[PDB]
Amino acid sequence: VTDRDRLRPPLDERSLRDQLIGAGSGWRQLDVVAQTGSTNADLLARAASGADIDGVVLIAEHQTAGRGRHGRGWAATARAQIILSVGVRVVDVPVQAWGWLSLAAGLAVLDSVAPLIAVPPAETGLKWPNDVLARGGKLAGILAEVAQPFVVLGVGLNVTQAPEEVDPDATSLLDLGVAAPDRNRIASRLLRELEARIIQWRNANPQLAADYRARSLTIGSRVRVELPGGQDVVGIARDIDDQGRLCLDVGGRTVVVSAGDVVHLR
Numbered sequence: 001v002t003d004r005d006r007l008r009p010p011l012d013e014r015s016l017r018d019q020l021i022g023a024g025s026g027w028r029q030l031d032v033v034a035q036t037g038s039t040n041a042d043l044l045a046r047a048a049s050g051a052d053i054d055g056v057v058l059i060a061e062h063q064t065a066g067r068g069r070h071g072r073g074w075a076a077t078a079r080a081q082i083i084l085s086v087g088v089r090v091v092d093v094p095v096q097a098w099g100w101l102s103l104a105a106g107l108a109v110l111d112s113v114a115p116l117i118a119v120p121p122a123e124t125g126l127k128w129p130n131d132v133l134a135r136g137g138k139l140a141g142i143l144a145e146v147a148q149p150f151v152v153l154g155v156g157l158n159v160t161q162a163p164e165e166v167d168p169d170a171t172s173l174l175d176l177g178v179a180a181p182d183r184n185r186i187a188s189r190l191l192r193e194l195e196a197r198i199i200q201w202r203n204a205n206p207q208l209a210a211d212y213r214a215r216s217l218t219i220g221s222r223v224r225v226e227l228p229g230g231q232d233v234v235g236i237a238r239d240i241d242d243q244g245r246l247c248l249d250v251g252g253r254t255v256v257v258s259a260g261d262v263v264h265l266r
């Protein structure tokens with residue numbers, strides 16, 4: 001809406017570089033572009049042309065052809081979200097562990113905005129795989145795409161984004177009660193949390209798995225999992241395995257799912 005613009009000042013690129021790039025930091029490069037098709041696609045194109053995208057951050061004020069999982073899309077209006085992609089070198093890590101990189105990303109996004117919201121802890125957390133949920137609404141979406149030897153990690157976070165402009169099941173920090181959210185503070189806090197989680201993933205830190213289970217909204221609840229190909233499986237989510245796959249209890253039978261859309265059954 002018109003009035004939400006006034007709550008959307010531009011991102012300060014120079015300020016973000018001062019905080020996030022330098023000694024003690026793993027980020028090598030940060031850029032803020034006014035508009036692009038997809039930040040994921042852009043970093044994928046860089047890697048495809050020989051660039052070392054490891055530790056490289058790309059942020060866009062607006063995204064016109066955003067990507068979702070399973071060939072879906074991601075909607076956004078200008079300066080209403082934090083829209084970024086980072087590059088991570090993953091070739092030194094066993095392929096079976098790559099699934100945890102996505103979960104670690106959602107963990108970092110959650111921790112960056114969790115204190116800002118005034119919602120009971122039982123309805124704020126991660127829906128498997130890495131959907132950031134708050135009061136039943138989707139606060140953020142994460143997308144991981146492979147470009148050897150890199151994985152491009154994409155984060156779309158609704159800051160002042162109006163649900164009516166993107167999705168009925170969507171929510172934002174503004175719609176959660178946060179009056180005047182500062183994208184500069186949040187982006188800085190996000191990328192520092194993200195740096196920590198990536199390092200934890202790369203070193204197989206068990207603290208990573210323990211922190212996910214403590215924030216999981218899926219584990220313990222009855223769910224319907226929409227599998228790739230259009231098949232549905234109803235059961236109770238019990239745990240995450242060593243590959244970041246969801247373990248389902250289906251009438252005593254264990255079903256491990258590597259990919260799919262989870263619906264918490266109310």
Ligand SMILES: [N-]=[N+]=N[C@H]1[C@H](O)[C@@H](COS(=O)(=O)NC(=O)CCCC[C@@H]2SC[C@@H]3NC(=O)N[C@@H]32)O[C@H]1n1cnc2c(N)ncnc21
Pocket residue numbers: 037038039040041065066067068069070072073074075076083084085138139140141142143154155156158161166167169170171
């Ligand atoms: N199209 N559509 N609608 C719906 C989509 O079909 C659906 C897509 O969700 S999804 O399949 O699980 N995929 C994701 O959550 C990952 C999205 C990652 C987006 C980031 S943003 C920067 C980077 N670049 C890029 O192209 N993608 C990543 O979510 C809805 N949706 C779209 N925009 C939304 C939003 N801003 N907030 C909440 N829900 C949204």
